[PDB]
Design a protein around this ligand. Structure first.
Ligand SMILES: Nc1ncnc2c1ncn2[C@@H]1O[C@H](COP(=O)(O)OP(=O)(O)NP(=O)(O)O)[C@@H](O)[C@H]1O
Lengths: 221, 602, 181, 104, 553
């Protein structure tokens, strides 16, 4: 609830976001209080700003400091969201491949923001308009579907949990999963054995094997 | 030498310390080039004079005794840069250039000897690669003492100390290290300072990464050092050792080649292609001098780009790009024109011969009278390969290899079976024929053919053939005659072209880089129907010139003429930077040779 | 659609990251400011050591109503111990503040006046530091294999600037290797 | 889009005719969709704007043959040919992409 | 008429607000005195974090164009180099706007005499003359307070006679030679000094600002060395090297020379395009050419070494250069070259005297790029003004060097041209004044620039008159290329040979006004500077007959 932890995990979400292999949950539970909080002092600052016109018949330093703080914080979430919107487009089909399925975790309110689901299907729909009126007419029957054939392939892609990324390990230690020699963690790779890990050590590998540790907040990217 | 070692420290200082705000340019440059395996660095003498004047004051004094020292430190610099220790690392090259101050060649005597001289001139001919020592070691013929000499630059015979005597040492050839040396033969610039006399050639020598940097026959700038060696009183041969050498603009070019890239070119070259006037603005690039003659004026451009050259298996290959005739009455501007044309070419040779100036128009292999053994002496056509062919006086060309022109233009080659050598060597050179027709306007009331020597076949060998006829006619003159006095003083027409530079026109030293640019991309090609159009156009060109010949008129047309007009298409298209060619695209190439078809009708 | 970069962060951006780190300053001044992530402060004692975020200090240093302290890690005699450790440990990269290269340019741009003799000194020491570290990087690059990477101590600038090359490549490695089965 | 005040995709994307009509309709329909992302936030965003991080905070922008002034928003800064300023990052973002402003 | 601290701390009160501001500089105009002054001033505003628009006006009338064009909520105003003669309250009008008026205006200049409207009747200004000219100037004191508010028959001609005494007094003021006095830069320097700030930059900007005019008189500039050298003694960058250092790296005094482009150009051509060498040693002459080679025959210097680049001349030739000069140059009357003035150092990038660094700034002014064509053109000049603005900025030294070589280009045009006019002998002694005219030649567009003819006729007045005894005479030059005969024409005044008895006060500022008060057909005061006007060839020849009489001076 600490306003600083808000931005700490906002950057955590952002920094993890662009470097991420594929789209991850929308942190509305905390962002919400943010997207309101921004407008809070966005309105306040103008009261003390026009209130600074009341002394006009000196200290603008924290004035434009506070002002700056906004655009600096507001820009933050931009790259975060926009990147997601992109990965949505990039994955737009797979998102529906997980969507039509029952199991397991779906868009819902759970993965996408309301604007994100709207943008999602409106984009894939209008995409369908554009692809259908132009190259599907002209649309022989087995070709009438845009999805798996099977092969090859198509999108499908990209549930690539396998991809390589840079990481930096951290957690508020019991001193759980800590086995030594100085520090945690495992676990062993799909085709290989354990390395393993320490928090002071940055260990680059498949996003799958490490993914849980992003979910656990056990490692930075 | 510990004095020289203090100087060594002085240069290590010079590198580690120096800053242009804030990166240390030479320092970056090193780790940059060590992965280039350049093992050399180009240093501004002005960042040096800016760093410490002292070291230059002594450097400018006896640089020869220092230049290697300068290297012995920077070769150590890589040691403290390339890797950490506690291989093998080659002894560095250094190449230094500076804005300096230009000096003319004719005035170079004594005085400045054993110092730095910036100067240009032009290279005539490249010597063959000659490798020289870097490290060598030797066991004694008698005591078997193992000596190690580091041979350094810049003679020095082998030291004899461990009968033992007089000097019992022979090179360990197995373990030794090496470098190339060029031996440039280069000539003063054509313009200054011949006075009355002949141009001098003063000999200089490249080594290592300096070698093969410069084409034979291109304008260049060398800095180097003026020095002497005996070479059989005391009468020792004048020369200059070379550091560092820099190409005169660009020249870069060779090989494959260069851009590099400076992105604005692609855009600026594409915008050219988006300019509908670009073809015609190229036409307006060609003669700031010549107002009018727009026809042949359009004809020059299409050659330089290179035309279709397609190699299809088997070894059959068709030439590019083509040939052109400037033959016409004096007053054509065609020599003035040609003296534009050659300066346009990135690489070419201007021939008014006979062959130019003293050149066997084809390479004439001539024995080295020393150590016997014929070696090919090169040729104007040979050196001009992949470049323009300039010809005046084509009425007078050497008759025997006139045929080698009759051949090289077509088969893109010259076969020399003479003496020992059988090698068929490349001239892909594209000819432009500027000769003056027999008796001027007198071959017009006659048969216009056989004008060129005794056969009409030369025309077939050529392509875009153009007869320039200037009658004394009104007002086409009074405007170019008006153009004249402007052209002369004060360049009242040469100012008027500079606002067309800002408004429209090309800079033409640019035009080099343009034509260099789009000749290195793969060959353009027409879509099928413009070709079939060449078929119904030509079936009537040929039909027309049999029917024209219903008068039993001797002549002119071939099947290499149609194909000739083909190559003009891919030329004018290579302007566009487009893999294809449009119907009308080709069509103005048709209207462009169409005047030559009436040259057949006249 | 970001297009650029896109996976990797722009150095331009990562500087925006590090600019969010805490540091000490020497205020000239004796509302609130309110802000968000700031907490502090009440009117902050002039000419005393105090902890703030970087970018604010950057801006007030631009008004010169504050002075930024040199990080206690950043000094000549210190760089010596670290670079020496670097030469005697051909494999490990030793130890660094990790936002440092950015910090270097950042401070030298403006904060230059506060240090004692950084000029013509540290920029060289860190150029060389980055040098031997860079060759340690590049030489470590032959062990490059799937799937394991220990970059251990390496800076975010250091890393990010080269990110595309190991990432993109290593995928071409692992993919084909496990693909063998 | 592009950015204020986009205020239209008209003349933007110069292809116009050259871009096939199915794509023309599609594209303009798609930025019709993106306008709804301008509806969703409520930031205010300026997703189209504010691509690159802020600093700091004030710059000097010079105008290139641009008038102007359109400056009714906020306050009127009087655009003239060869006019530069000293101003915060905020107002820059629009006329810097609008092509009017230049130097950073 | 106020000390700077007051008006400055007051402009603060109207200074910060968002959106800005509202106050703005008017850079005026192409004359260099503002440029440094504006820049330091710019930095000042940038140091106090205050938004300001930056306007590079050119034309005098163009000022009216701009003030009337867009100023809305503007609460305060800056202006430079203008209104030292004509009042804007008349020119703009203005009119009262809301005591404690809605808008403040600042105006700076060294040109004299001030307008009568300038010190008194404070509305727009906020007269900036302080503390230069008090004077008094007790004549404007009677120009109002005796004038205002102005037996009944005999006191009528009495009141009108005393008023005619104030009329005949005040008539002489405002009718008088117009002259520059002090580089505004040092005013803003002592202003910045009053505030307590001194930056080595700002003093170097002061140098360039003061130095800006050094081809023109001094006159206080002679005593400005102390007002500067002392500040150079006020700056002690270090007790000692500290080699180099690569940074700071700051200026010192040294043997400067009136000789031109010394550091970056050949010593030969340095003597050769140089102004002081020209007239004294007769440069258009081949006689003085060979005679110059006699100087090296006393300098022990090769003609080659004269063709040499300054960077490569022997350290020996450098150290002994001045002493050599002392042993020789005193022969031909060249003893006044040597000057002890100021030289900036970027060290590794080289060192440049102020005097030198001036010229390339003046290069970017004319080069380095139906009545609408010349407005578009003036607009191009104002465009290339900015490249000179950044050419003040050290951050890019490279763009500066453009204009640096360009100086060799400029002078190569000029020097050649002047001689070209000398062997033609285009001089007409007339009676009252020497005058010439240029009908045509190469690069007349380059002669469109007020400064090209300014430098030109400067070089040519130094040339035509050293003296060159006797009785130095004022000058005028003219040229045309395009526009149907705008005939750019400028007024000019003789420079003494370094030994100035009097200020000398150009009368053509008034005289050209007498012709604009005359038939004034085709005459154009569109120029900011009274020294120069546009004129049509059709009426310029009678403008010349009307220039003959009445001779005012
Ligand atoms: N546009 C122009 N058209 C014609 N003549 C020109 C033109 N511009 C310049 N000239 C002048 O006229 C001459 C043109 O060359 P020209 O008289 O045709 O000799 P040439 O034919 O080119 N030399 P040659 O090949 O031996 O016949 C030059 O010497 C110029 O002085």
């Amino acid at each position: 609830v600490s306003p600083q932890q808000d931005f700490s995990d906002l950057m955590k979400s952002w920094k993890n976001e662009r470097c991420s292999p594929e789209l991850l949950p929308y942190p509305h539970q905390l962002m919400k209080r943010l997207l309101n909080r921004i407008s809070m002092q966005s309105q306040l600052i103008e009261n003390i700003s026009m209130g600074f016109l009341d002394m006009q018949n000196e200290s603008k330093l924290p004035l434009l400091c506070m002002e700056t703080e906004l655009e600096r914080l507001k820009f933050v979430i931009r790259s975060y969201i926009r990147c997601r919107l992109s990965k949505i487009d990039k994955f737009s089909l797979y998102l529906r491949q997980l969507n039509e399925d029952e199991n397991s975790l779906i868009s819902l309110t759970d993965l996408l923001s309301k604007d994100e689901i709207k943008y999602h299907d409106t984009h894939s729909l209008i995409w369908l308009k554009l692809v259908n009126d132009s190259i599907l007419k002209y649309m022989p029957e087995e070709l009438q579907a845009i999805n798996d054939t099977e092969g090859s392939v198509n999108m499908i892609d990209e549930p690539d949990w396998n991809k390589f990324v840079f990481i930096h390990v951290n957690g508020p230690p019991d001193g759980e999963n800590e086995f030594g020699k100085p520090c945690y963690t495992v676990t062993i790779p799909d085709l290989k054995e354990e390395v393993e890990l320490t928090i002071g050590s940055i260990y680059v590998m498949r996003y799958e094997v490490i993914r849980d540790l992003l979910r656990d907040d056990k490692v930075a990217l | 030498d510990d004095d020289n070692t203090e100087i060594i420290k002085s240069f290590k200082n010079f590198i580690l310390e120096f800053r242009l705000d804030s990166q240390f340019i030479y320092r970056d440059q090193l780790r940059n080039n060590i992965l280039v395996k350049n093992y050399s660095l180009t240093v501004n003498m002005e960042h040096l004079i800016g760093y410490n004047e002292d070291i230059y004051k002594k450097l400018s004094d006896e640089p020869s005794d220092i230049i290697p020292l300068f290297e012995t430190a920077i070769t150590q610099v890589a040691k403290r840069i390339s890797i950490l220790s506690r291989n093998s690392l080659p002894t560095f090259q250094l190449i230094l250039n500076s804005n300096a101050n230009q000096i003319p060649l004719r005035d170079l005597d004594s005085e400045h000897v054993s110092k730095i001289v910036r100067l240009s001139g032009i290279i005539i001919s490249t010597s063959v690669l000659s490798s020289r020592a870097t490290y060598l070691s030797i066991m004694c013929r008698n005591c078997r003492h193992t000596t190690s000499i580091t041979i350094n630059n810049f003679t020095v015979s082998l030291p004899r100390s461990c009968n033992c005597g007089p000097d019992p040492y022979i090179i360990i050839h197995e373990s030794s290290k090496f470098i190339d040396q060029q031996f440039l033969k280069l000539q003063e610039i054509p313009e200054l300072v011949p006075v009355g006399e002949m141009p001098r050639n003063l000999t200089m020598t490249c080594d290592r990464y300096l070698t093969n940097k410069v084409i034979p026959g291109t304008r260049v700038t060398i800095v180097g050092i003026y020095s002497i060696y005996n070479s059989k009183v005391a009468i020792r041969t004048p020369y200059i050792k070379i550091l560092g050498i820099q190409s005169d603009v660009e020249t870069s070019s060779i090989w494959n080649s260069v851009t590099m890239f400076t992105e604005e070119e692609e855009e600026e070259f594409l915008q050219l292609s988006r300019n509908p006037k670009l073809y015609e603005i190229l036409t307006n690039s060609i003669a700031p001098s010549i107002f009018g003659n727009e026809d042949i004026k359009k004809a020059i451009v299409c050659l330089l780009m290179g035309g279709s050259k397609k190699i299809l298996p088997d070894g059959m290959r068709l030439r590019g790009d083509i040939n052109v005739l400037l033959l016409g009455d004096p007053g054509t501007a065609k020599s003035q024109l040609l003296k534009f044309v050659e300066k346009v070419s990135p690489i070419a040779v201007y021939t008014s011969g006979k062959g130019s100036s003293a050149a066997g128009l084809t390479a004439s292999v001539q024995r080295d009278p020393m150590t016997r053994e014929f070696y090919l002496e090169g040729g104007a056509m040979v050196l001009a390969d992949g470049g323009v062919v300039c010809i005046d006086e084509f009425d007078k060309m050497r008759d025997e290899d006139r045929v080698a022109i009759h051949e090289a233009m077509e088969q893109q080659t010259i076969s020399i079976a003479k003496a020992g050598i059988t090698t068929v060597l490349n001239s892909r050179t594209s000819v432009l024929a500027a000769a003056n027709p027999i008796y001027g306007r007198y071959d017009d009331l006659k048969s216009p053919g056989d004008n060129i020597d005794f056969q009409t076949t030369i025309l077939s060998r050529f392509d875009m053939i153009f007869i320039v006829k200037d009658d004394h006619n009104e007002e086409r003159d009074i405007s170019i005659a008006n153009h004249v006095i402007n052209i002369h003083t004060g360049n009242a027409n040469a100012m008027q072209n500079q606002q067309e530079e800002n408004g429209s026109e090309i800079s033409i030293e640019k035009m080099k880089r343009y034509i260099t640019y789009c000749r290195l991309k793969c060959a353009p090609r027409l879509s099928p129907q413009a070709a079939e159009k060449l078929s119904s156009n030509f079936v009537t060109i040929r039909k027309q010139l049999l029917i024209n010949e219903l008068e039993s008129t001797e002549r002119p047309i071939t099947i290499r003429q149609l194909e000739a007009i083909i190559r003009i298409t891919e030329s004018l298209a290579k302007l566009e930077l487009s893999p294809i060619a449009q119907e009308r695209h080709v069509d103005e190439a048709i209207r462009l040779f169409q005047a030559s078809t009436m040259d057949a009708a006249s | 659609l970001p297009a650029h970069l896109q996976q990797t962060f722009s150095p331009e951006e990562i500087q925006f990251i590090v600019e969010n780190e805490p540091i000490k300053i020497f205020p000239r001044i004796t509302w609130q400011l309110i802000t968000t992530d700031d907490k502090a402060l009440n009117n902050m004692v002039a000419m005393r050591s105090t902890e703030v975020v970087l970018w604010i200090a950057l801006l007030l240093k631009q008004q010169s109503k504050c002075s930024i302290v040199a990080p206690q890690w950043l000094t000549t005699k210190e760089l010596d111990r670290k670079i020496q450790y670097e030469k005697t440990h051909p494999d490990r990269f030793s130890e660094l503040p990790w936002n440092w290269l950015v910090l270097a340019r950042i401070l030298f741009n403006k904060a230059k006046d506060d240090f004692h003799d950084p000029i013509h000194e540290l920029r060289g020491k860190i150029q060389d530091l980055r040098e031997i570290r860079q060759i340690k990087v590049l030489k470590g690059l032959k062990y490059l294999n799937e799937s394991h990477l220990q970059l251990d101590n390496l800076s975010l600038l250091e890393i990010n600037e080269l990110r595309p090359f190991i990432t993109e490549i290593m995928d071409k490695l692992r993919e084909i290797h496990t693909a063998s089965l | 889009n592009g950015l204020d005040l986009m205020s239209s995709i008209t003349f933007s994307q110069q292809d116009t005719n050259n871009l096939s009509h199915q794509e023309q309709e599609y594209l303009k329909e798609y930025c019709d969709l993106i306008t709804d992302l301008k509806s969703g936030d409520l930031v205010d965003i300026d997703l189209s704007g504010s691509l690159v991080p802020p600093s700091d905070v004030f710059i000097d922008v010079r105008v290139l043959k641009d008038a102007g002034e359109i400056q009714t928003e906020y306050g009127v800064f009087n655009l003239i040919k060869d006019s530069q300023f000293f101003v915060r990052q905020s107002d820059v973002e629009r006329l810097i992409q609008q092509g009017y402003l230049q130097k950073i | 008429i106020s000390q700077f601290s007051e008006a400055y701390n007051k402009i603060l009160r109207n200074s910060s607000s968002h959106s800005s501001c509202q106050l703005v500089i008017f850079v005026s105009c192409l004359n260099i005195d503002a440029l440094c002054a504006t820049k330091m001033l710019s930095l000042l505003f940038k140091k106090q974090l205050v938004q300001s628009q930056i306007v590079p006006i050119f034309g005098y009338s163009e000022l009216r164009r701009h003030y009337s064009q867009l100023d809305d909520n503007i609460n305060s105003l800056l202006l430079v180099g203008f209104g030292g003669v004509i009042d804007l309250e008349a020119f703009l009008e203005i009119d009262p706007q809301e005591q404690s008026f809605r808008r403040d205006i600042y105006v700076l200049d060294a040109h004299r005499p001030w307008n009568l409207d300038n010190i008194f009747g404070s509305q727009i200004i906020q007269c900036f003359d302080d503390g230069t000219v008090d004077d008094t100037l007790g004549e404007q004191k009677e120009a109002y307070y005796k004038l205002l508010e102005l037996n009944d028959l005999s006191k009528r001609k009495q009141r009108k006679k005393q008023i005619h005494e104030y009329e005949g007094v005040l008539e002489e003021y405002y009718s008088q030679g117009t002259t520059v006095v002090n580089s505004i830069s040092a005013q803003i320097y002592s202003l910045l000094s009053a505030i307590g700030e001194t930056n080595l930059s700002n003093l170097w900007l002061n140098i360039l600002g003061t130095t800006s005019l050094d081809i023109a008189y001094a006159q206080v500039y002679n005593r400005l060395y102390p007002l500067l050298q002392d500040e150079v003694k006020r700056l002690t960058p270090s007790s000692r090297n500290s080699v180099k250092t690569p940074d700071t790296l700051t200026l010192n005094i040294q043997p400067d020379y009136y000789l031109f482009l010394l550091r970056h150009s050949s010593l030969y051509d340095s003597f050769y395009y140089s102004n002081y060498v020209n007239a004294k040693l007769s440069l258009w002459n081949e006689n003085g050419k060979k005679r110059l080679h006699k100087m090296f025959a006393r300098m022990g210097i090769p003609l080659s070494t004269a063709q040499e680049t300054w960077l490569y001349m022997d350290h020996s030739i450098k150290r002994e250069l001045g002493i050599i000069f002392d042993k020789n140059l005193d022969r031909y009357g060249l003893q006044d070259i040597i000057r002890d003035g100021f030289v900036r150092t970027l060290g590794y990038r080289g060192s440049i005297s102020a005097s030198e660094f001036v010229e390339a700034l003046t290069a970017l002014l004319e080069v380095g790029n139906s009545a609408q064509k010349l407005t578009n053109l003036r607009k191009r000049w104002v465009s290339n003004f900015w490249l000179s603005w950044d050419a003040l900025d050290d951050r890019k030294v490279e763009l500066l060097n453009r204009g640096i070589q360009l100086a060799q280009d400029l002078q190569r045009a000029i020097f050649n041209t002047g001689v070209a006019i000398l062997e033609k002998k285009l001089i007409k002694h007339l009676r009252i004044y020497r005058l010439c005219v240029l009908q045509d030649g190469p690069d007349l567009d380059l002669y469109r620039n007020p400064l090209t003819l300014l430098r030109l006729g400067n070089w040519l007045i130094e040339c035509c008159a050293e003296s060159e005894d006797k009785q130095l005479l004022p000058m005028v030059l003219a040229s045309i290329d395009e526009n149907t005969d705008t005939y750019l024409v400028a007024g000019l005044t003789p420079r003494y040979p370094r030994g100035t008895k009097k200020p000398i006060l150009n009368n053509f500022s008034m005289a050209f006004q007498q012709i604009t008060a005359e038939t004034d057909a085709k005459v154009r005061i569109d120029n900011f500077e009274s020294s120069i006007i546009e004129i049509r060839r059709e009426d310029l020849s009678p403008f010349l007959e009307k220039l003959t009489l009445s001779g005012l001076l």
